[PDB]
Design a protein around this ligand. Structure first.
Ligand code: SF4
Ligand SMILES: [Zn+2]
Lengths: 216, 105, 249, 66, 251
DNA sequence: TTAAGCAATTCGTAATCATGGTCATAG
DNA sequence: CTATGACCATGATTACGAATTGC
């Protein structure tokens, strides 16, 4: 954030984030000469990339989505087309845009609150009445569909434990609570999402019954 | 850059933040970020102080670690030895290497 | 293997022109109870729910529960290569991702198209059944003209259901206006009321909802406290078609 | 009230009952009672004359993304 | 307190549909003689005089010589929201600067009640001369619109020759010259060229397309001209009054 | 009262132009 | 009910202004 008049002369993203104060604190904000960090969230105002910028801690505590198409075509794509072309021809632009094309077809994500009360078939994604995990046409193949995804729960369990005990060694103590919300540590907010991945993947396997009793 | 100054006659001031911001071109200039880059590492505090005395002892150990880190950075980065050699080769005082540019020399 | 045959292809063309503007991709849940569909719109605001029951298909055969992924634009382009009197049969394998449509003229000319499907990773949502307290049954033409006529003034509309009738009001920079309707076969406006209602909804969604007007003569509007307004149509011994829209706060 | 909100804030930071910022308040009160360290019979007698209020029946930092 | 009714009310839709493409505003002079409108054009070539007598209405209460101003095209966009069988009612308070339109239905089940706000006006106003018009022609309006539109695809401005036996509508264009001749026909489809002395004049055919926007507005169209004067086209608004469009001639 | 200098590649952001698509009118 | 014309927007391309690095 440099001198304020050159950034008066033309609208930028970081200047817009800095000059927009917060409701919590109009006494801690970027000044002249420092660096402003931001990420770009997804919206439908395509004329302006200065209308989609947000503080990293604010998108942390308020959980706004990310514009994967912005990061795909505006951040990544053109440096790669600088580097990868001179070794080959223009079939190399088509090779990386086709290596995108085999891999672009896999995406993951008022009225939106009135959902749930049923879940889609784990095999073929068909919404249906009742809580059972398998579909009646894909009911036979179920031992393989249980086998699949318990090796995913197994790998999320292994990632929870390596992270939440690293904070205990970076903190010093093994007997008291961790309080470190250090925004420059990758440890923070990577220890926050595995709790939710595990929360979700544990509940998907309770679609299947229990492997035994527990009150004996 | 726009800074305040406070007057002390006889004594010399060396904020390590200004030395980093003048010499080095980095990505973040927080104490955590430069302590990781060189070495390798408000509302909660108000209830660690309105509590008991072992909480206040924990607060004091945290504050003493904070007050110790810039000494280690000053002696490890060879700051002061290079400032003394710069003042001996150029012939300007030791307060001008934190306030001025490359014209007075 | 799936194979259906239906004599009135016009019903199929009306339902496919209900949806080709609001939706771009869908998944058909083919079952042994019929052909059922749920989807959200592209704007993530409104819900569609379409049911074609199994009986009304005059030759049905479904072996196993399927799920087909259809681009609705290409299908809407295919179903306009079929005149309004033809007899439509659908042919699908249980191992394939390509659908067959055969149109049979009622006179020397038969036509057959193959369309490539797509695999999609969508999630299916639904609705719970509660009793909406304001129940309107009104002519569809009047509702289409009322929405289209209030549309030029401003973009919101307030629905005001009172005892004898309902009253729609709308404002804008060139002024405001309302339209009344009162209790008095299908040109009547039957109004059941327990608690009065007043709510606000945007007009672009309503002018999307009134695109499927040739499917029936009357339209059913259901309201309650703070729930999404329901617009409901019935298709004769085939099933129904419902849109869902949430009120403004 | 306003004196009952400092007794609970004092029970929450005494180190001789446990390291408690992940669980409820009454669970930690019963955990110490099982081991019988010395729970006092006043941090119980305000968790009974209230319903499920989130500013009595919750730890101090039950916000705060730690 | 102005409060007036019109049962066969499609005529108001019909006049403002032929009003809004010409001019953007109107000076509505409500007198006890009824509803009147003298207004110039925007290009300083033409003029509209609308007269609506009270005896062409149904039910009437006029207590004020109101002199208001209407932005026409927004009023036309509001008038597009009512059918043609529907009854048109106007209400006006002499202190409340708004127009309250009430559209009744012929089956009375759909009620409309619209409101358009007012804006101030200081419009210019000139008087028409009264004189002798050397050629007055009674014509079908649809045939007249058909003929001038048939001439619109040749050129831009029309030359007219008005004489005893026939009348001569000629024009040039980028494809050459053309002209159509008419004669009297020996009640709505009857024509008559009443003539004293033959003349020749120049007029703008595009303003004839603008004037034929009132094609469904009467039984017959009247075309009144003389030497070097504004052509007055007349659409006799049946049982109501009349609309006269003046066009100052060309040089 | 004090300040090291300039050349830029380069990419982003904004504005303008072109092209089609949709809606409304008129025949 | 279709066909034609007009309007409106939307998308793409080109030109200019700005953080960092090469000297
Ligand atoms: S979050 Fe990162 S910086 Fe903070 S204690 Fe854990 S490992 Fe250390
Ligand atoms: Zn299945």
């Amino acid at each position: 954030l440099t001198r304020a008049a050159s950034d008066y002369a033309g609208k930028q993203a970081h200047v817009e984030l800095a000059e927009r104060m917060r409701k919590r604190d109009p006494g801690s904000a970027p000044s002249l000469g420092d660096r402003v960090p931001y990420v770009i969230i997804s919206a439908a105002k395509g004329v302006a990339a200065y209308m989609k910028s947000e503080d990293p801690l604010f998108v942390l505590e308020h959980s706004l989505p990310i514009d994967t198409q912005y990061y795909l075509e505006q951040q990544l794509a053109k440096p790669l087309l600088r580097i990868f072309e001179p070794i080959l021809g223009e079939g190399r632009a088509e090779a990386v845009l086709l290596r995108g094309d085999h891999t672009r077809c896999k995406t993951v994500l008022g009225l939106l609150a009135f959902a749930k009360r049923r879940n889609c078939c784990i095999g073929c994604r068909t919404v249906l009445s009742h809580q059972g995990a398998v579909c009646e046409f894909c009911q036979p193949r179920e031992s393989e569909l249980y086998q699949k995804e318990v090796s995913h729960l197994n790998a999320l369990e292994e990632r929870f434990s390596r992270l939440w005990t690293q904070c205990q060694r970076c903190q010093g103590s093994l007997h008291e609570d961790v309080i470190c919300t250090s925004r420059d540590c990758p440890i923070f907010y990577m220890r926050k999402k595995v709790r939710k991945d595990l929360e979700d993947q544990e509940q998907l396997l309770r679609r299947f019954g229990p492997p035994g009793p527990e009150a004996w | 850059r726009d800074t305040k100054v406070v007057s002390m006659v006889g004594r010399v001031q060396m904020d390590m933040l200004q030395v980093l911001l003048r010499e080095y071109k980095l990505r973040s200039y927080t104490l955590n970020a430069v302590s990781f880059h060189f070495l390798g590492e408000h509302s909660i505090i108000t209830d660690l102080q309105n509590g008991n005395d072992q909480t206040r002892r924990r607060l004091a150990v945290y504050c003493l670690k904070d007050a110790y880190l810039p000494l280690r950075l000053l002696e490890r980065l060879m700051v002061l030895v290079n400032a003394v050699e710069m003042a001996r080769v150029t012939g300007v005082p030791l307060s001008y290497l934190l306030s001025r540019g490359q014209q007075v020399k | 293997m799936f194979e259906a045959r239906l004599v009135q292809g016009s019903i199929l063309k009306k339902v496919l022109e209900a949806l080709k503007d609001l939706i771009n991709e869908a998944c058909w849940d083919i079952s042994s109870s019929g052909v059922n569909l749920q989807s959200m719109d592209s704007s993530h605001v409104s819900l569609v729910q379409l049911t074609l029951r199994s009986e009304g298909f005059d030759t049905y055969r479904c072996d196993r529960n399927l799920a087909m992924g259809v681009n609705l634009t290409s299908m809407s382009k295919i179903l306009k290569c079929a005149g309004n009197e033809d007899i439509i049969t659908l042919r699908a394998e249980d191992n394939a991702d390509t659908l067959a449509l055969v149109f049979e003229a009622p006179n020397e000319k038969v036509s057959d198209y193959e369309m490539k499907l797509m695999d999609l990773d969508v999630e299916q949502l639904g609705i719970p059944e509660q009793e909406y307290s304001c129940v309107v049954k009104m002519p569809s033409g009047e509702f289409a003209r009322i929405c289209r006529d209030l549309s030029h003034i401003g973009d919101a509309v307030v629905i005001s259901c009172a005892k004898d009738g309902v009253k729609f009001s709308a404002s804008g920079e060139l002024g405001n206006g309302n339209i009344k309707l009162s209790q008095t076969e299908e040109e009547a406006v039957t109004i059941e009321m327990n608690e009065p209602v007043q709510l606000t909804f945007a007009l672009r969604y309503l002018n999307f909802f009134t695109k499927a007007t040739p499917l029936s003569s009357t339209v059913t509007l259901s309201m309650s406290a703070d729930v999404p307004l329901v617009v409901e149509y019935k298709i004769a011994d085939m099933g129904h078609l419902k849109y869902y829209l949430a009120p403004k706060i | 009230e306003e004196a009952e909100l400092e007794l609970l804030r004092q029970f929450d930071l005494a180190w001789q009952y446990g390291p408690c910022t992940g669980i409820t308040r009454l669970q930690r009160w019963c955990r110490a009672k099982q081991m019988g360290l010395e729970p006092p019979p006043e941090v119980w007698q305000v968790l009974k004359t209230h319903p499920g209020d989130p500013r009595f029946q919750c730890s101090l930092w039950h916000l705060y993304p730690l």
